[PDB]
Amino acid sequence: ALISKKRKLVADGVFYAELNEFFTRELAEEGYSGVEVRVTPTKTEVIIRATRTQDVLGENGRRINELTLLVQKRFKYAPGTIVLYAERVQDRGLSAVAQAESMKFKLLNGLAIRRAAYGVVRYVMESGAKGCEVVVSGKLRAARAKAMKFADGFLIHSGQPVNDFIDTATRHVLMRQGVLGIKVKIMRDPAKSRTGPKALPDAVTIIEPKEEEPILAPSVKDY
Amino acid sequence: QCRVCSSHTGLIRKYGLNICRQCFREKANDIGFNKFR
Amino acid sequence: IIKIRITLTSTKVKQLENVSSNIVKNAEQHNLVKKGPVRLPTKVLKISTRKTPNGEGSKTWETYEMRIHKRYIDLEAPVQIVKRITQITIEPGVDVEVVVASN
Amino acid sequence: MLMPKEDRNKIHQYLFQEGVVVAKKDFNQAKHEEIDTKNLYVIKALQSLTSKGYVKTQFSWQYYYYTLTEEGVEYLREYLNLPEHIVPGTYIQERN
RNA sequence: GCUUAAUUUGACUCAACACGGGGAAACUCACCAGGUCCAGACACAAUAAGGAUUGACAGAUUGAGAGCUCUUUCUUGAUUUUGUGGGUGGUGGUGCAUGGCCGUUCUUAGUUGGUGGAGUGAUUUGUCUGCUUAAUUGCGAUAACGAACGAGACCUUAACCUACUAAAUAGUGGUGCUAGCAUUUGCUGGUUAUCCACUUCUUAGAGGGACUAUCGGUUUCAAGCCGAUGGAAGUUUGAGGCAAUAACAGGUCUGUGAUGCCCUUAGACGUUCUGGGCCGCACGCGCGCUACACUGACGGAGCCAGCGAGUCUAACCUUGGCCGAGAGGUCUUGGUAAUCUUGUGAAACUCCGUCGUGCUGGGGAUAGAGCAUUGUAAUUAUUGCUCUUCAACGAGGAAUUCCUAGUAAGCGCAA
């Protein structure tokens, strides 16, 4: 009560902007990149999405109601109604938001960076992408700030497609080599979209039309 | 408060969010602000 | 059996015309008295901030935006009709409220 | 940094069914529910306790986090000299 | 620059100098000559009761803020004060090693491949003489023919929808209760609920509409460019957002440098608890502010808007009735938001006057007397209303400009 109107639509975003940090800073394996808050009547159901729910379930509650005891106590939220419904997060290279987490960690445990680089590419550009984008600009064993680079594609951004192709995707390092704030942007192939547009706005396609009857001699018929 | 990125000044006191503006440009997406014009 | 009022103030305009349609759908399959979804003038938020972390460089700025849409419906029904249908029109990002103000 | 040891209930006790320490980077107000400091005590006392393990610290906009693990059975079960199946951390509650 | 008890510094051609969101006192704190107490993970150790300390003074002490002094009753209780050597300890006055994306710039007004030609070869044609375009935009020529990125396209806005469908949180149209009414038919009112009927104006969803259309010139008759009448609209229809080649070792948040000396552990990094940071005479390149006046001041009236904002664990907006010359003070409400402040009755301008060209009533720059508010505190005037004093200042030498047709300029006073 005594509730300010527009602030409740901006305070929850601040609440959105900080809950994601632990799914960065605590886990690495399962792929739980995209968080999703579903508020039903009197319950906040953020959907736990884990491919290997044994860190969370384990011995019937390893971290089901263990992670909640921080965050529900952090926001002075009531216990019990902090429902964290378990699910499986989506595929590794074969998703959209996971392409952050796909390459958040895939620089090596200690060999040459080119053989790190040329691995990551051939998977999904054929199997579910025409645009993704990672970040690399670092040195090789000298006192130079050299900048060698790569990527895979041109993206899909044609206007308002900057603001639905950019998303909640900020994932850090689980690599032995290289640490700083690493960022990934993701703009997939349009041929399998199923939500909105399907082709780039320059594209045009005319249809074939079929071969013709020769001359159509009159032969009129009376039904 | 001084939040993070070498700032206790230029805070955004408006709309009750209280963020240092150096650390707003990288957080303005997931809040749900977007530029259009 | 009391005149009620529902409000919904969300920020995904595609996900507000599905909800406002199925509100007037199941009411009209039971054919209650109603008045149409009145759509209010939307609200925009903005903050100008210059575009550099340090201060050394040329000067023009940004401008960020956030759009809030809000519309509301008045209604009257027996309470058993409404107390079920307001619990099956949930969707994330969407807020629902019931007001039974009959002063 | 002194560790004043006047009250174990306000040092380490009722986290056996909590297992978590939420905190705050703070500075001098000396009153906090659900945890064992007033506002400074367990903060500088977990500094010793982290350095024997068993609590893991995130920062995450200046809210200190802590949680227990396997190397915690060696003090709580014996300083409060209680039997098993009532203390534990991996089974912190009726379900977790 | 000077000055200093220090005036904390970053940045000097466009691409430094109203900018680091640097509008102000103790928050900021990075600085100066006082004051502090906090320095311990483990592994070392000794006084560990016959004593460290926990004494915090325990108040007169104690000279100088509770104090660090004992004059003692101790919670005494080895926490830790300690004493070290590792390694701690850890964080803040700068960036640097296995990672940079955040900026500003030259402003991709241009870069690159597929099969073909030409060369032993590196390399080259395509990517051109010409005209055309805001544009390697396009026509044409042609050993080259198809094509991608960038530019077009898109995206958000501002303009047109008597065509929908749906309005006590918009509005008119009546029926009334109801007051004026010249009255006499009438023109202005009347408000919760007097009730009904409406969407044109209003707001927001769904669609539509412009393509340079149609005619006349002009040109290799080509790309196009000029007129014309129609049309809400014929300057990419008006304005923006978004688009990577490069030496500024300014990109640093619990960036870590994923540096080993910064004392980097009686810290010169904290706080509370202290006066002094941007704030000292005789010249500015500091981007217009108030001028230099009758197209003007002063005094009476007339009276018109747009996008934004807001109170619960709490003091935000503020209208009437209040006292007073303001400034304010007191009594109330209303407003979690098209409802309330708020029609935000803004200013220039607008009539009727007073004034009479003199540095006069133009112009108030330094000042002394006063009343108020805000906080722990305004002296070195933090701001605001009184009355006084009216001092440079008669259109500016040589020079040189953030701003494009509802544009340049005035005029605002919303966050």
Structural domain spans, chain C: 1-103
What is the distance of C-alpha D10 from the center of its chain?
10
Q: CA A215, A216, A217 angle in degrees (round to 5)?
A: 105
* Number of B–C residue contacts, CB under 8 Å: 31
Beta strands in chain A (DSSP E): 37-40, 43-46, 48-49, 86-87, 132-133, 185-186
Two structure tokens written together for B26? 């990288």
Q: Please report, to the nearest 10 degrees, the dihedral formed by the alpha carbons of residues A18, A19, A21, A27 taken in order.
A: 180
Dihedral sign of CA atoms D12, D17, D20, D24 in order: negative
Tally the C-alpha atoms within 13 A of residue B8's C-alpha that lie toward its C-beta.
Answer: 2
Tally the C-alpha atoms within 13 A of residue C99's C-alpha that lie toward its C-beta.
Answer: 10
Q: Which nucleotide is nearest to A4 (CA to C1')?
A: E336
Burial of D17 (0-12, 13-18, 19+ CB in 10 A): middle
- 3-class DSSP state for residue C18? coil
H or E stretch including C93? none
- Contacting subunits of C (3+ beta carbon pairs below 8 A): A, B
Q: What are phi and psi of C83, to 5 degrees?
A: -70, -10
Put simply, whether C98 touches A (Cβ < 8 Å) is no
What is the distance of C-alpha C100 from the center of its chain?
17
Comparing CB atoms, the residue among B17, B30, B34 nearest residue A163 is B34
Yes or no, beta carbons of B12 and C47 under 8 Å apart: yes
DSSP state of C14: G
Q: Are residues A34 and A40 in contact, defined by beta-carbon separation less than 8 angstroms? A: no
Comparing CB atoms, the residue among A5, A10, A38 nearest residue C92 is A38
Comparing CB atoms, the residue among B16, B29, B32 nearest residue A7 is B16
Burial of C43 (0-12, 13-18, 19+ CB in 10 A): middle
Q: Please report, to the nearest 10 degrees, the dihedral formed by the alpha carbons of residues A46, A50, A54, A59 taken in order.
A: 20
Chain B residue nearest residue D26, CA to CA = B1
List residues of chain B with CB under 8 Å from any CB of chain D: 3-4
CA→C1' distance for A121 and E11 (Å): 43
Nucleotides of E under 7 A from a protein CB: 10-11, 15-17, 19-22, 28-29, 38-42, 78-81, 88-90, 93, 97-105, 148-150, 152-157, 165-169, 203-206, 239-243, 249-258, 271-272, 308-313, 336-338, 415
Put simply, whether A80 touches D (Cβ < 8 Å) is no
Q: Residues of B at the annotated binding site?
A: 2, 5, 20, 23
Q: Could you give the CA distance from residue C85 to residue D94 in angstroms, rounded to a whole number?
A: 35
Q: Are residues C77 and C65 in contact, defined by beta-carbon separation less than 8 angstroms? A: no
- Contacting subunits of A (3+ beta carbon pairs below 8 A): B, C, D
Asked whether at least 3 C-beta pairs link A and D within 8 Å, the reply is yes
**Domain covering A7-84, topology:** GMP Synthetase; Chain A, domain 3 (3.30.300)
Q: Could you give the CA distance from residue C78 to residue D85 in angstroms, rounded to a whole number?
A: 53
- Contacting subunits of B (3+ beta carbon pairs below 8 A): A, C, D
Q: What are phi and psi of C37, to 5 degrees?
A: -70, 105
CA→C1' distance for A149 and E247 (Å): 19
List the resolution, Å: 3.7
Q: Could you give the CA distance from residue A152 to residue A136 in angstroms, rounded to a whole number?
A: 13
Chain B residue nearest residue D27, CA to CA = B1
Q: Are residues C31 and C16 in contact, defined by beta-carbon separation less than 8 angstroms? A: no
Put simply, whether D69 touches A (Cβ < 8 Å) is no
CA→C1' distance for A38 and E301 (Å): 64
